[PDB]
């Protein structure tokens, strides 16, 4: 239908890759980075892409990046996806912008769905 | 500066009381209602008001009370205050639109603090 893009955030790369993965194998266009730097670097240039990043990150936090984002005023739908989140934590990536924060461990279903949800706000 | 009112929602008259007291004592203008319900029916009603809502309420939750102030598309800048919240639920909250979901035990300064923040998207 939408032709666009999941671009996945995670500084570990058997986590980046085991999401990349399942998600490609669901029919989706796919793209990994290394690190949230990378993908703040890589976004201005970013064309119908949703974002998935993970939460707790050491240089810069998948929250830190989404206010990053908004400061670049750039508009990308972000999930947020964390096996050490909170609800502080849940509150400030809803105000950073989210679409939604889940947390770990999840069924393809569930992220899938939130992809979905958030190609819905690509223009 | 101002001229707002807090409305205060909980189905337990003690708490519902102490907040409405404690931010009385700080020059805020303060209005108890007995239920969400309550608060509902009322709700058409309010000009210049910023809700502070308990989650946690046997007929329907302080979210519940978000999504139908939604559904009636009433507009009303909404902080919901729990000692039984999730991630999960925070997120809903938000998603129903509120300025802010915050856990309880918290000083007077944070509610005081979010309060003031949401009056300034009155219109």
Redesign the interface.
């Known amino acids: 239908m939408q032709d666009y893009t999941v671009h996945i955030v995670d500084d570990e790369e058997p986590v980046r890759k085991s999401l990349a993965f399942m998600l490609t194998m669901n029919g989706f266009a796919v793209k990994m980075h290394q690190s949230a730097e990378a993908f703040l670097a890589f976004a201005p240039d970013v064309r119908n892409g949703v974002l998935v990043t993970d939460l707790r990150m050491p240089d810069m936090s998948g929250v830190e990046l989404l206010r990053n984002l908004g400061d670049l005023k750039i508009n990308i739908p972000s999930i947020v996806i964390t096996g050490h989140?909170?609800?502080?934590m849940?509150?400030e990536a809803?105000?950073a912008g989210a679409v939604?924060?889940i947390?770990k461990p999840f069924e393809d279903t569930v992220i899938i769905e939130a992809i979905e949800r958030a190609s819905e706000h690509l223009v």
């Open positions: 989140g909170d609800v502080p849940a509150v809803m105000k939604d924060f947390e």
